[PDB]
Amino acid sequence: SKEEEGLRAQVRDLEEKLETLRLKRAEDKAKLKELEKHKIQLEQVQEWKSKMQEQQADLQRRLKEARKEAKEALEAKERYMEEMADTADAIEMATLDKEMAEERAESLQQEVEALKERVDELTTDLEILKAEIEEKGSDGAASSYQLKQLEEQNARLKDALVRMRDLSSSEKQEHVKLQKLMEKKNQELEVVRQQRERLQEELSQAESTIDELKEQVDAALGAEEMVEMLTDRNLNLEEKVRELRETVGDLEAMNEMNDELQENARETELELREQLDMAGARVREAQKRVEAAQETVADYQQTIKKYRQLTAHLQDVNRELTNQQEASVERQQQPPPETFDFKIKFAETKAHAKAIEMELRQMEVAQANRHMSLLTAFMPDSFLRPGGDHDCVLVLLLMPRLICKAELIRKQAQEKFDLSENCSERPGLRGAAGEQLSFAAGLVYSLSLLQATLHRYEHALSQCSVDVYKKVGSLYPEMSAHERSLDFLIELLHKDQLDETVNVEPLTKAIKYYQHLYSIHLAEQPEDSTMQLADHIKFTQSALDCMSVEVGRLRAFLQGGQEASDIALLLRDLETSCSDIRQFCKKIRRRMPGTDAPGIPAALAFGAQVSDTLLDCRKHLTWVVAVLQEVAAAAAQLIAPLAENEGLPVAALEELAFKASEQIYGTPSSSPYECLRQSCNILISTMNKLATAMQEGEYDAERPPSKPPPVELRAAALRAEITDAEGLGLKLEDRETVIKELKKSLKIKGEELSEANVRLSLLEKKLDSAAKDADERIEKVQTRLEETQALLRKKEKEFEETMDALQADIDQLEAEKAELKQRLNSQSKRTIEGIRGP
Amino acid sequence: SKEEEGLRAQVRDLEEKLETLRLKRAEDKAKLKELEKHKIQLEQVQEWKSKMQEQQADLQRRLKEARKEAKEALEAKERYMEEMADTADAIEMATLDKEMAEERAESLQQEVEALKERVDELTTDLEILKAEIEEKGSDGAASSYQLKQLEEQNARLKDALVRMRDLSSSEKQEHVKLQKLMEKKNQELEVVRQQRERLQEELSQAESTIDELKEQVDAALGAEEMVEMLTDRNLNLEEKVRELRETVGDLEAMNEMNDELQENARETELELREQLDMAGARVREAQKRVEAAQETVADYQQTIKKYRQLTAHLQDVNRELTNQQEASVERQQQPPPETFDFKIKFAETKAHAKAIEMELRQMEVAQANRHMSLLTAFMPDSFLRPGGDHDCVLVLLLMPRLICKAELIRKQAQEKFDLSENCSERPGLRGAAGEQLSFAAGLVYSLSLLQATLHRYEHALSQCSVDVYKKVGSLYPEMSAHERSLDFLIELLHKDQLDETVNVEPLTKAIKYYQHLYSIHLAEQPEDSTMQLADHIKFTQSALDCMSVEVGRLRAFLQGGQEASDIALLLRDLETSCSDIRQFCKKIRRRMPGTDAPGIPAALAFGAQVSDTLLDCRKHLTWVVAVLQEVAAAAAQLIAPLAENEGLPVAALEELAFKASEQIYGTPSSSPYECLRQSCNILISTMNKLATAMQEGEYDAERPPSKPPPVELRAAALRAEITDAEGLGLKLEDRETVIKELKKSLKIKGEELSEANVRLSLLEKKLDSAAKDADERIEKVQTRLEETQALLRKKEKEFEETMDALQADIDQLEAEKAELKQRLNSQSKRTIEGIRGP
């Protein structure tokens, strides 16, 4: 199927999605781990972020402070440069003035020193005196000439003195400037050394600060480590809280179903509890129905006691009125029981016994149906096919069943409507009571007709041929369909709804059908005279009941004062005829077979003319009943609008009788009076003759039981057909076995032939080659004998040479021994014969 | 198709799995959203952190500079107010130096004036000396002093030259030592400046390190704030995990009651439904009593109709006898005719239907009997023969019939004797009431056992083989004989004569019969687990009823005041064991198959171990019931002569209990106390285990496949053969022709084989004769050969013996020759030595 392939594709698709989304949840949990890492990092960057915000603010504030304090230091320094300007400008006058004063003093001092040198220079300027001096002579003046040369050398030296004095002054000035620059440099060196020591202290402070900050970072790393291990714990707990929340939701959902389920169970327990409150009242109210039917069984039993005491007392009063043969008249042969009482227990016992009986009967019915099914399983389809032997059996059952149903309806209808011989005198025949009685009588009449027809069927099928039996059986469906009119009537009786409003169309149709079918297929079957006559009596009695009821109704329809009218006389005559025919029926019934009383024959037999007379009697009875019923129906329609004290005119009833008689008898212009009178006269004469013949024993006969019924003949044929083919199967099995054994025997004994036949060939050849082989072992053995004899002769000469050689050796040895003895003697003799010279 | 439904179920399962892990995925992806904005704003706060670290670094730079600058501005102001002081001093003593230099210049001015006066004086004196020497001309002795002054001045001037040359060189020595003190101090200042610069660089590096460490400290101060964030969160989450786990536990716990309460509600519901089914069994029993009292009203109403017809007939006879005696007229009065005119009419409207139903059922029974007689007529003789298929069908019918009769009797007996669960507390258990209850309980127990056995029979025969079916059918007369034990009991119930005096041996004895016949012919047929369990429950309940009744009777038999004895509280223990086992039976019955209620399986299936356990349970039940019944019977006819106020001693009841316990349990010297208690413990344990396994569905199964009953196959076969048996005849004709041909072929090569065998025997006559002739001309030859061979061998020892003798005979001769030779040699030597004279 294509749908299977589509479902398989969707299964694979869903399985693949389940792989992918499981793998994705695994990835997606790992990715949640990345969430929690990012959360730690975000809290770290946020904490550093806020701390950073005031760190930046604090650095800005410190920068504000440091720059403000630097600017204030600069402002102080600047107002203070102003004070510098004042004092320094005052200095540079004062040094200008001191410097002019010092330069003036130094100029005056150099002029003082040059003037002292000029005083000495003038003492040497006495050198000028040379000119006056050497012009005078030679002793003192010319001596002063050399004096003056020395004096000029002096003047020469003095100038160099002055020059180096000036140079020394310059050097002194430079000296002072140098040493007081040096004082400045010492101050600078001291300041720089102090600044170096301050920088060393500040470096030591910063450097201790680095160490202390490292220590603080270590403690705060303890805090970070504290954070990380707190966070690991916290993430585990978050996962667990989340999972527990989900589980809590699931459990809440289960608990909520369980709460409806308990509520529904509680509602059902409440419903069962007032169902038990119902049912205790139902057991009490069915038990009140039980004590009520047990009070009805009570009162039925107190009234079977009251009818038992009443029947006992009426029997004792009757037996007292009969024991009255003598004056005594005083004997009640029964002790009075009381009321319900022992009878109570009798009926509770009988109800218990009847309950047991009904359970047993239900069990029997179920058993019969089961046995029925099991048996049906065993006989073949040819039996069960439509129109087969089963349908014929069903027909044989159908007629007794139909007869029984018709009898049940007839008896119940007679009892319910109190159909009695005196129905014509019942009050209220003009109204609904008359219609009810007419309906009941007609129903009983129709049922009697049906029963007679079915009795004919039963007899004919008990004695017909097998062919007719099968033909009737083939009609079983159609002629079983008509039972279901009678079933309708029985259902109406069961519901107490059988009344004059009931439609009897189907029953009449069924009767006509059965009569017609009998006329077609069973017409020349013989009839049973005994219960042909019994059925005739029953039919006649039912027809007479109908006739009497209709006569009474028609009399009630007549207007008062018309009793001397011609129709009223006819009605009275019909009533008298009814009584007479009923008396004849009773007379015939007394001699009817069935009881082992003296004078009653075992059976009846009469000729075909008696049967024809009975048919004619039935036809006339049917005509009279039909006429009366039609007239009464029309008259009832006419009388309905009339008052109770008003009646119909004889003219109207006469017209109705004219019409009905013409329609039913078929004879135009025949008076209904003398049609009906003729029919009744024929009936009276016929029953009178029949009653006389019966009383005289003219019809007495010995009783003709049916030959083996066609069903038994057919069953014997079917069993024979089954058997001498059922045994054929066993025969076939045996012939199977025989055939297998036989052809097995064929190969076995054929290949026994083949073996024997090879053996023939072999030992024919063996006989021939046995002649051959006998010859050739004879030659073998006889060659062997020759060879052995040849050895014997061989060995015999060899023996003989060996004998001869050994004997020669023995002879030679004996001769040699004798020769040695001779030689011994001869040597001894030669010794003494050699000494004697010749 | 099966596969489409399986695929749809798998699709549904896949879909639910995807939806569950999609919802877990969805929670996870909400958390992933949480991640994914956490990552966005981690990058945002990280850009922010890095950017503002840049800004902080710039601020740190600026603040370093500003501290630098404030320090330098303060130092400049301080040096500069040092300079204010220095400048004020310079002003003051520049003014003072101006005044000193002024009077110094004035003093030198006075000196200049005096020296210019002396220069004028010397010029005048030189002019005077000029005039004097111009006057003198001739001169003497005045040229000496000036000469001396002029060497002394040449020397003085050269010495003063050298003198303040030395002074200039000393000033330059001081000035050079000074200047090199400059240069050393400037180098010292340069070195201190270099040290200061290096210190300042190192301090700058240290300050950078300090700022970075301070910032680390900042981040980790934030970390401390997380430490206490996370600590609080972690405590709260631990508490929340604990609370969520507790809520999970609470929800699980009242889910657990909700399940238990649902089970208790179902149990109470079924007890209410058992009470509703005994209210409805009282409705069905009060019905069958209303139906029984209504067909009893129908029979009594037919009886009052017969009594009414008889009383009307007797009243008509008495009234014609009263025709001459009395006739009534009566004034106005309204006593209705007969106490039940419309009471009988109402019971007629109602159970007139019941009378009709009785008649219809009777004719249905007659029709069924006739129908199955007619059908039997068509059945072959092989079917109807003793041991045939008919007997097998009759077995299949007999044994459901037996079951139905069986609890008809059980069901009536329970009602009649009011066998209830509380029979142990009924008054009068010591007397006839106890005996009646014991009889009723035992009867119900036996009937339950019989029903269980027959149920096994029904199940086995529905599924056995045809062969087993056939021998079981062959035993039909024998098992059908046992039915009228039950028929006798139904007699007794119908007559209300079923009491404790009834002999139940035929029933027990039929039960034992059926128990073999099953053990022999149906032993390895499979059992129906469901209705095995159902029968076990029913049997156990009946046994418990017997059990309780006997316990109550034994308690009633005990002496007053012996309630504390071992036997009395053993009896109490047995009573509680009964109650517990009954509760387990109810539990099991609740989930038992048979109703279309949810949770009830279609069928039950359990292994052979469970079946064996059930058998053991039944065995122990039987033992305990038998012991109690035997003890109670013996005690009852020990207590009969005792007064109502007197009781049995515990010694007597114990001694009876010991006797019964041995000869039922078969174990000598075992205390009845352990035996009974152990049996009850086994029952309770097993029965509780079964209830539990039943309650969690361990035995649930579908109904097994229906497979054709042996009767069906047989029936089919029987009917089948009937059909094919037509064609079998044609086959038999063919097989017969084959057999005739096979036999003919067998005969021909039958006497071909015989002919070959004869020829074989004849030809190997020929060989044997030919062989014999050959053999005894052959024998004749090797007789000669054997004789020659024997001669050759014989004639060969004779040579060997002889020629050994010849060898010895030569060999003696050589010895004699040797002796003569050494005699000859001795004589020869004497001849030679005698020939040389000495």
Residue numbers in the entry:
A (entry chain B), B (entry chain A): 214 to 1051
Passage from the reporting paper:
Cytoplasmic dynein is a microtubule motor vital for cellular organization and division. It functions as a ~4 MDa complex containing its cofactor dynactin and a cargo-specific coiled-coil adaptor. The formation of dynein-dynactin-adaptor (DDA) complexes is a key regulatory step in dynein activation. Here, we determine the cryo-electron microscopy structure of dynein-dynactin on microtubules with LIS1 and the lysosomal adaptor JIP3.
Previous work showed CC1A and CC1B fold back on each other in isolated dynactin. We used AlphaFold2 together with previously published cryo-EM maps and crosslinking data to generate a model of the autoinhibited form of p150. We find that the ICD is docked onto CC1B in this model but is detached and connected to it by only a flexible linker in the open p150. In the inhibited p150 the ICD blocks dynein motor binding to CC1B, showing an unanticipated role for the ICD in p150 autoinhibition. Comparison of the two p150 states suggests that DIC-N binding destabilizes the autoinhibited p150 as one DIC-N copy partially clashes with the ICD whereas the other would displace CC1A. Comparison of p150’s inhibited and open conformations shows dynactin autoinhibition involves the previously identified CC1A/B hairpin and an additional interaction involving p150’s ICD domain. Both CC1A and ICD need to detach for CC1B to bind dynein’s motor and LIS1.
